[PDB]
Design an enzyme around this catalytic site. Structure first.
Site, PDB file in Angstrom:
ATOM      1  N   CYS A  53       0.788  -1.225   0.000  1.00 18.12           N
ATOM      2  CA  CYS A  53       0.000   0.000   0.000  1.00 18.12           C
ATOM      3  C   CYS A  53       0.825   1.283   0.000  1.00 18.12           C
ATOM      4  CB  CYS A  53      -0.930  -0.030   1.215  1.00 18.12           C
ATOM      5  SG  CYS A  53      -2.068   1.336   1.343  1.00 18.12           S
ATOM      6  N   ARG A  65     -12.334   5.351  -9.764  1.00 15.67           N
ATOM      7  CA  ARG A  65     -12.390   6.761 -10.128  1.00 15.67           C
ATOM      8  C   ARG A  65     -11.167   7.464  -9.548  1.00 15.67           C
ATOM      9  NH1 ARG A  65     -16.062   5.231  -8.090  1.00 15.67           N
ATOM     10  NH2 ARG A  65     -16.613   4.976  -5.876  1.00 15.67           N
TER      11      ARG A  65
HETATM   12  O1  LIG Z   1      -4.102   1.182  -0.383  1.00 18.00           O
HETATM   13  C1  LIG Z   1      -4.125   0.105  -0.935  1.00 18.00           C
HETATM   14  N1  LIG Z   1      -3.825   0.037  -2.257  1.00 18.00           N
HETATM   15  C2  LIG Z   1      -3.839  -1.155  -2.928  1.00 18.00           C
HETATM   16  O2  LIG Z   1      -3.567  -1.210  -4.118  1.00 18.00           O
HETATM   17  C3  LIG Z   1      -4.191  -2.380  -2.184  1.00 18.00           C
HETATM   18  N2  LIG Z   1      -4.301  -3.680  -2.518  1.00 18.00           N
HETATM   19  C4  LIG Z   1      -4.643  -4.358  -1.469  1.00 18.00           C
HETATM   20  N3  LIG Z   1      -4.777  -3.527  -0.377  1.00 18.00           N
HETATM   21  C5  LIG Z   1      -5.163  -3.956   1.000  1.00 18.00           C
HETATM   22  O3  LIG Z   1      -4.006  -4.512   1.709  1.00 18.00           O
HETATM   23  C6  LIG Z   1      -4.459  -5.680   2.472  1.00 18.00           C
HETATM   24  C7  LIG Z   1      -3.341  -6.720   2.603  1.00 18.00           C
HETATM   25  O4  LIG Z   1      -2.330  -6.103   3.383  1.00 18.00           O
HETATM   26  P1  LIG Z   1      -1.075  -7.080   3.611  1.00 18.00           P
HETATM   27  O5  LIG Z   1      -0.387  -7.338   2.333  1.00 18.00           O
HETATM   28  O6  LIG Z   1      -0.062  -6.304   4.567  1.00 18.00           O
HETATM   29  O7  LIG Z   1      -1.519  -8.467   4.278  1.00 18.00           O
HETATM   30  C8  LIG Z   1      -5.701  -6.214   1.743  1.00 18.00           C
HETATM   31  O8  LIG Z   1      -6.719  -6.725   2.615  1.00 18.00           O
HETATM   32  C9  LIG Z   1      -6.233  -5.063   0.892  1.00 18.00           C
HETATM   33  O9  LIG Z   1      -7.264  -4.472   1.702  1.00 18.00           O
HETATM   34  C10 LIG Z   1      -4.494  -2.261  -0.811  1.00 18.00           C
HETATM   35  N4  LIG Z   1      -4.454  -1.004  -0.212  1.00 18.00           N
END
Ligand SMILES: O=c1[nH]c(=O)c2[nH+]cn([C@@H]3O[C@H](COP(=O)(O)O)[C@@H](O)[C@H]3O)c2[nH]1
Ligand SMILES: O=c1[nH]c(=O)c2[nH+]cn([C@@H]3O[C@H](COP(=O)(O)O)[C@@H](O)[C@H]3O)c2[nH]1
Ligand SMILES: O=c1[nH]c(=O)c2[nH+]cn([C@@H]3O[C@H](COP(=O)(O)O)[C@@H](O)[C@H]3O)c2[nH]1
Ligand SMILES: O=c1[nH]c(=O)c2[nH+]cn([C@@H]3O[C@H](COP(=O)(O)O)[C@@H](O)[C@H]3O)c2[nH]1
Lengths: 358, 358, 358, 358
Positions: free
Chosen positions: C189, C285
């Protein structure tokens, strides 16, 4: 006495020490308005100015900035006639719906001057410069301020004085339209290492902003911006706009020399208080440098960089429920974090293969 | 009881934990006066002394320091006759407008002695040494202090005792002219790792300075100085002058052996409490070393190093509106910063190509 | 005003800032019960859900999770018909004594949907999905919440809305069965870097949990979990369960593409808000990405990963005297630690040759 | 409730977070007495015990420790008969003026046992073991404590139970002679990562020491000691002695296997809760490991290591004016430092060429 200096010492925060808390949002983010006022006669469509550095802003950068709704400050490490010509070329440069123009439909432009260069200022003013930016390391200099007042009286353009980092300095600069905040946070700045003087940017902006608001002056956060997220924080901390050096250096429009190393493209970026910059029209009364010389990777065009930065700003504003700049400054709330929090905020425990911003 | 030790524990700060806040400045910086008094009879033109280490100060360093307005402390890791000869060579060494001289126009010089070496002291005194520096790891030793008092009574030279890090120690050293502060901050010091004892330098200087001011004693901040900015902070924290080891080691005048590695020039720099130094006239009553051996890159001449350091000090004093040392100590105000603040204070997000100080 | 934002700023903590204090234990650890309720109709045998990401959960992962007593959330970066088929394959998949099944003995399964995709939701509901997970970056969006309410009224499955990081958001989501906490802590993230918005996970979970408990809603801690120890902390901070992305990615069941580098096995892991994921049915979006693309080393089977994680959780619960989840949430006490404490907590001053978890 | 857990969270400190403040010293340091009592019948001449680990203490280590005035705890990862034989070999091993002997002039020795191994204990007791060390990860286990009480009643040797990290645990262990403090600080420990449970060592020792002093129990600080300076801090924090694993591993006497890598000598060092140790007589009721396997460089003989450690301890005691252990515990005062302070405490801004302790 000395122990009390430490006991009474204020705690200063920088961009990485804080995060904005998400809030209920009614409109976001593609409908977010990022226009902002920096002077009585100047409102930008995006809260971004390009630094007045010889590796960042010359006429091409200024044109690109104004076309995107921002503002370019032509650097002063050149002759007066060269600077007036740069200004003229921008004013006559004009598909760009966000461009910021003056009454005659000409792109806006700003130019930097020393607190004592009244001659340069008048020439820039006559050339049609929209904003005169008094560009000094420590604007809270009495002798300099006296000269600044005389300068303000001899030009029609709007007046921006910087840089400062103490609210008390605003009290003596009420004749200006806005103050630029930033002493020591720059990516190529060594002022805090060489002189031991400075104030963490978030704290500096907040202290100055409260005082500036009391006098009707606008605030520009200058230096230390590395990510779009920093822009959201700076504005939430009280700034009306930010000034970028590093993030705009390395763009096609930046005047910095190109450099290839290991097949990879870079562009030179250096402090105006560096030997290189000094070896190029300023002659500071400084015995030692307070800036370094380096290179930044090729970033592409100014347009591409601004799209990303503004994109991030809009996302952040949506997350806090801010439909415009005034509301971000108004309701943005912070949560202070630790080093561990900083680590978790960035990507972690992963081998990155792509961090692309599209 | 033990939990209260932690609950009542004071919070200690070092150079990197603080920054000086800019202030209104009426005169700066090329007109800044950096002269400072360290003893009743000795005022230096620059607040800098060279460390009494065998890889830092011998006659050449002392001559260079005095010619620039500073002071060199000839180390005591040699015989008494060798040390008296070093002193004499300096006193008779005399284009150097800032030089510090005695009544007869001879360059000033200082020399270190053990708290118990009254014989060495008297010989140095007769040789014309201007300042006798009692050089010990922990000056707050009663037996040592009794010997020091006898020594003070048998010499005419000014008297500096160090090092200490607790204000309570000043109360028992009021017979001296000044105290040297610093237990554990040295670049090659391991006292805090080996013994677990020490006090962050900014806090130590402040606590001691308040107590010293009550008795009329001067204060010298010894160790941990890495940048000119640290000097500004040390003085603002209460010190009258600073003592440098690392920054002066590696200069042409330094006695440290030359070392080439990967085509690059270096000079040896080691703690006096290291095996190497011990293997060279002191024989400490210590079972284990409290210093290491290393090398520092070639820095050029003492003159070039001092110009940079003093240049930075003057810039910092200008930024806070201090026309002289007394005013820096008087009005310098601090802002405490976090680790993130430390990172932003140094150059960042850039590939440095040149950090030159000219 | 701006200075008060900083003075009143709350201090946020993440997993590494805290440790649980050991307590008297009557039963542990092999007799520890880790079952937990996340919705009115769903109690898992282990407090773990697999992330709804295209490199983490598709039918195979969901089957493996349910067979171990956990829950898989089928990602929504695919067509509606493709997602309903994934769900059906899981429900009909059935040696697995800890499996979680519905009334008809079919493995439980969850699926993600956008706050506005009411069509997708109804189809998933008809396909027999047990839990509908509204999957958004900032659930505290009014327009989105209005759509969510309409969705809740048209499906029978249990309802989980996320993600949020402010307790105030719970007040407007009381129509849901549980809320998912986590804005910015994910391993891939960049939301905090791009938008500057977020809240350290431990603090976020605690604030939300107190508010959720007032309304009868369950809490799921999503993102930032790197070790089994983080799970114990999250639950002690108020969470009923955690959601894992990184730790489950790289397992045999994960749909991420395999990648070999230097003879070593890896699997792709990327944010759903990354270009790659966007280049695959969602169309956000958003102007810029808030996630990166990377790879994680091959971890083996889901079964092996869960055994380790649950093993650690049970050890931690035994150490604090918690025989079940309710007691961990009830009596778990924290001690805040410094960076140095973090260093001492991990293995140190050793050349590791084996860190195997068996 | 959950937010209060964070608001009321105690702040924990480890060795690197603190430094001892120098004080007036009347006698030091070569005349410093480091003898210390750990049980009603056992006073060591040096406050050091060797860890009960299979890569640290077997008969040779125990002999070396006792000959220097310390104590070796024979590990329990072997059969009962093998352990009794190790004990006997030590008791009959007897130029060593500091040796600690029993009434019959035989070297002292200790041995570890599980809280439930009453058979092993009685055999060790009959073999003449001087101290029985109940060796468990979490001694505050009620069932275990009941077994411990029965054990205490069936042996004559002195009784040490550990490890704990909460003062409340002392209240239920008043039948023992001393408690061992340390949950998670070990160099090869992963308990805090796997279970999320632990307490920074300085804080843990202080809290336990205050409670132990109320009941007449002695305290041993176990784990996390990397430098002699840590020993001084541990004792000043309330401990009567410390237990070393890492620092004694790699010595000639250590049973760890030798390993050569890049021409350099090392010895294996691993946690007793590691797969390797488990693959060797204990069978813990743990599902996952809480220790790692690694190697430490060859350190020379136990005698050489102890000389350095004790040397440092004596230097530290001299610096604070402590002529003996009781006075260090009595008057040692701390100053809390920041990360920057930690950096300045170690050698810095130097290329080390030699760190030798002679
Ligand atoms: O801000 C974000 N941009 C993204 O592109 C993204 N992809 C996944 N997630 C969220 O991250 C969670 C998994 O976190 P971990 O890899 O630390 O286990 C997961 O549960 C997802 O909620 C995202 N958050
Ligand atoms: O102390 C300084 N010494 C210098 O040599 C120097 N050069 C540029 N600047 C200022 O840094 C700002 C750009 O900062 P960034 O690179 O982080 O965007 C710009 O806006 C400039 O104000 C300097 N400050
Ligand atoms: O604990 C110590 N063990 C040593 O072996 C040692 N050698 C030098 N010094 C002191 O360090 C000071 C120089 O510090 P810098 O290198 O940082 O300028 C000098 O002024 C010396 O006081 C020592 N301290
Ligand atoms: O949590 C743990 N898992 C393990 O596998 C382990 N092995 C040893 N120990 C303990 O660590 C202590 C030695 O610590 P040092 O290496 O830092 O001297 C020793 O005194 C042991 O108490 C362990 N703790």
């Amino acid at each position: 006495k000395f122990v009390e200096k430490l006991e009474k010492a204020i705690k200063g925060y920088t961009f990485d020490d804080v995060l904005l808390i998400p809030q209920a949002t009614e409109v976001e983010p593609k409908d977010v308005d990022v226009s902002t006022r920096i002077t009585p006669n100047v409102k930008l469509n995006i809260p971004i100015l390009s630094a007045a550095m010889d590796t960042v802003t010359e006429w091409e950068m200024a044109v690109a900035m104004a076309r995107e709704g921002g503002l370019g400050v032509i650097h002063r490490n050149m002759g007066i006639e060269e600077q007036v010509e740069q200004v003229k070329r921008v004013k006559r440069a004009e598909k760009y719906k966000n461009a910021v123009r003056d009454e005659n439909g000409e792109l806006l432009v700003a130019a930097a001057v020393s607190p004592f260069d009244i001659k340069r200022a008048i020439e820039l003013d006559k050339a049609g410069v929209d904003v005169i930016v008094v560009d000094t390391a420590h604007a809270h200099n009495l002798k300099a301020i006296k000269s600044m007042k005389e300068m303000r009286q001899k030009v029609d353009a709007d007046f921006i004085v910087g840089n400062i980092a103490n609210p008390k300095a605003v009290d003596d600069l009420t004749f200006a339209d806005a103050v630029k905040v930033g002493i020591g946070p720059g990516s190529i700045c060594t002022t805090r290492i060489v002189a031991g003087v400075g104030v963490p940017q978030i704290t500096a902006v907040a202290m100055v902003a409260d005082r500036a608001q009391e006098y009707g002056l606008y605030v520009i956060a200058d230096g230390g911006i590395r990510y779009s997220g920093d822009i959201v924080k700076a504005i939430a901390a009280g700034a009306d706009a930010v000034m970028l050096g590093n993030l705009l250096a390395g763009t096609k429009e930046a005047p910095g020399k190109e450099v290839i190393i290991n097949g990879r493209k870079y562009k030179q970026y250096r402090g105006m208080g560096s030997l290189g910059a000094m070896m190029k029209y300023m002659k500071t009364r400084k015995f030692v440098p307070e800036g370094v010389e380096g290179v930044v990777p090729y970033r592409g065009t100014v347009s591409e960089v601004l799209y990303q930065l503004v994109g991030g700003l809009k996302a952040g504003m949506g997350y806090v429920g801010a439909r415009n700049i005034r509301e971000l400054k108004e309701k943005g709330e912070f949560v202070i974090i630790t080093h561990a929090g900083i680590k978790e905020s960035h990507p972690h425990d992963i081998i990155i293969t792509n961090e692309a911003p599209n």
